[PDB]
Amino acid sequence: HCHFSPRDWQRLINNNWGFRPKKLSFKLFNIQVKEVTQNDGTTTIANNLT
Amino acid sequence: ADGVGNSSGNWHCDSQWLGD
């Protein structure tokens, strides 16, 4: 369920006698590091580009 | 020589054992 969808799963299982994985690709991007400051009941979040 | 959002160098550590 972290890969397929209910429609895709139903389509796969209603027409096939088997399956198996072949290839894998993985990507990490749009990364932001955010600093947090606490001085009272409130909290502030700021960007930290470095 | 880069900007503020590009990292210089990486974290290597480890060790390699060669023949000699």
Cβ neighbours of residue A44 under 8 Å, at least 6 residues apart?
Answer: A36, A37, A38
Q: How far apart are CA B17 and CA B20, in angstroms?
A: 8
B4 in contact with A, Cβ within 8 Å: yes
Kindly list the distances between the CA atom of residue B1 and the CA atoms of A17, A19, A32, B12, B17, in Å, as whole numbers in the listed order: 56, 49, 21, 20, 33
Resolution in A: 3.1
B5 in contact with A, Cβ within 8 Å: yes
Which residues in chain A have their CB less than 8 angstroms from residue B5's CB? 49-50
Residue A37 near residue A46, CB atoms below 8 Å = yes
